[PDB]
Amino acid sequence: ETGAWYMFDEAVEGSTNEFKDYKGNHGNAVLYSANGVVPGLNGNSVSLDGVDDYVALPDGIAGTFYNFTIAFWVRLDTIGEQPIFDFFDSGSNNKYMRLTAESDGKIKFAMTQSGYYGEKTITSGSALTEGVWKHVAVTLSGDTGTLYINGENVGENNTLSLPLTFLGETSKGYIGKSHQTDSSEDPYYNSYLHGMIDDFRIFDRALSADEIKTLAS
Amino acid sequence: ETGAWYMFDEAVEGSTNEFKDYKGNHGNAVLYSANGVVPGLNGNSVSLDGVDDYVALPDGIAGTFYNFTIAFWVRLDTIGEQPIFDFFDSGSNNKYMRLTAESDGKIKFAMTQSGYYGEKTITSGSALTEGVWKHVAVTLSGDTGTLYINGENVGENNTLSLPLTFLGETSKGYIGKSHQTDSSEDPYYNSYLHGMIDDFRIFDRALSADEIKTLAS
Numbered sequence: 001e002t003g004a005w006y007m008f009d010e011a012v013e014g015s016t017n018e019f020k021d022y023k024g025n026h027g028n029a030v031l032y033s034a035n036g037v038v039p040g041l042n043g044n045s046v047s048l049d050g051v052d053d054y055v056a057l058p059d060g061i062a063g064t065f066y067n068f069t070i071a072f073w074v075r076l077d078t079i080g081e082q083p084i085f086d087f088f089d090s091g092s093n094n095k096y097m098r099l100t101a102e103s104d105g106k107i108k109f110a111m112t113q114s115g116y117y118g119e120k121t122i123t124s125g126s127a128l129t130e131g132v133w134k135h136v137a138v139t140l141s142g143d144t145g146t147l148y149i150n151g152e153n154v155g156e157n158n159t160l161s162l163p164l165t166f167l168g169e170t171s172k173g174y175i176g177k178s179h180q181t182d183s184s185e186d187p188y189y190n191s192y193l194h195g196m197i198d199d200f201r202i203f204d205r206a207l208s209a210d211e212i213k214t215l216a217s
Numbered sequence: 218e219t220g221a222w223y224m225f226d227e228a229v230e231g232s233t234n235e236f237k238d239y240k241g242n243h244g245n246a247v248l249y250s251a252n253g254v255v256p257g258l259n260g261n262s263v264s265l266d267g268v269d270d271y272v273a274l275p276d277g278i279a280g281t282f283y284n285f286t287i288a289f290w291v292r293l294d295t296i297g298e299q300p301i302f303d304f305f306d307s308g309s310n311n312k313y314m315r316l317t318a319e320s321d322g323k324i325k326f327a328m329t330q331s332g333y334y335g336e337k338t339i340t341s342g343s344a345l346t347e348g349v350w351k352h353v354a355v356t357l358s359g360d361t362g363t364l365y366i367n368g369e370n371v372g373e374n375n376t377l378s379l380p381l382t383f384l385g386e387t388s389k390g391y392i393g394k395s396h397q398t399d400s401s402e403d404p405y406y407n408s409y410l411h412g413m414i415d416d417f418r419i420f421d422r423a424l425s426a427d428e429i430k431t432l433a434s
């Protein structure tokens with residue numbers, strides 16, 4: 001085998017803060033936390049105070065692979081800018097890969113060979129946050145439908161050939177209410193939107209992404 | 218021109234609850250809310266109580282188009298299952314398209330010609346929620362990197378040719394701490410993760426999506 005697995009269930013004998021690699025390929029992870037490990041998802045889990053707690057992994061654990069996967073379970077107790085993991089060159093400070101929590105619950109992965117300003121990144125999608133004004137749009141273009149939040153593409157379904165059109169002349173429309181469908185399992189029937197709405201707009205074509213962006217300005 | 222635009226700034230003369238289409242192509246939107254319109258994003262905005270308030274749009278506004286866009290601004294005051302808009306056949310209850318808010322701030326768009334159980338949908342991406350255990354994974358396969366939350370793909374960057382590899386033998390790794398980069402604008406330096414972590418795993422290849430799913434079980 002290759003790779004590692006930290007289950008963080010119980011310190012190794014002889015210590016209070018060392019946790020083994022269950023795959024038996026790498027050294028012990030070291031925990032710096034006054035909490036220690038506590039009941040969590042699978043047996044025990046690391047609990048970090050968000051102040052100065054972290055885990056040191058042994059050197060070399062990820063720098064010898066061309067392709068790879070890093071995976072773990074996490075319970076985020078504070079929404080904000082925070083490092084989740086960071087694997088970096090011991091010889092310089094501008095060669096690294098780091099997964100971060102973002103200003104809003106999104107996550108970002110960055111790899112760079114030229115410091116902070118050269119990061120190549122991947123960022124997760126936006127969602128609707130409580131009490132925060134956002135722009136939403138749906139576009140249908142042939143078989144492809146697209147969802148946008150603040151002018152960013154957040155989903156597609158390229159298999160949409162479909163209902164109202166034509167004989168849509170007498171179609172009904174609500175904002176914030178649904179009509180009664182054919183199913184009592186519909187959870188939206190009799191649910192009413194709690195919020196505010198503005199500039200409701202409809203177009204008889206599919207706007208492009210930067211067209212969408214411009215509305216979201 | 219074609220299409221509509223409801224700015225919801227001021228009731229039309231002679232009424233208390235009618236709002237015109239600024240494009241002058243469709244009838245008045247009708248508001249059912251004891252709140253009326255109030256200061257919002259652009260001038261005034263509709264405020265729905267989440268109990269029984271909604272807006273009726275005039276019949277036909279969207280059922281005569283092959284391709285289209287629906288776009289608006291929204292401020293969601295309660296996270297949960299709620300209809301945002303619904304355009305449906307006046308002759309049956311199983312021919313409609315509806316945009317909904319979901320259990321967690323995501324949004325879903327559905328079109329159907331065969332009732333609730335036949336909905337074809339588009340759903341926005343997951344994010345990390347406060348106090349909620351989630352599975353996260355990053356995979357690098359050739360030039361393509363992928364982010365996953367609970368086994369669902371939430372971002373990619375097909376242009377990743379890059380840093381540690383090789384000479385990665387002495388690379389350093391943290392969970393919950395970042396090293397100091399070359400920039401004082403780095404907001405992650407000196408930030409510490411507030412949360413829990415379990416089953417931290419590393420692989421020297423890129424797992425497939427259902428492989429990822431299986432870890433997220």
Ligand SMILES: [Cl-]
Pocket residue numbers: 007008009010011019020
């Ligand atoms: Cl263990």
Ligand SMILES: [Cl-]
Pocket residue numbers: 224225226227228236237
């Ligand atoms: Cl108006």
Ligand code: NA
Pocket residue numbers: 007008009041042043044045415416
């Ligand atoms: Na564990």
Ligand code: NA
Pocket residue numbers: 198199224225226258259260261262
């Ligand atoms: Na307005």
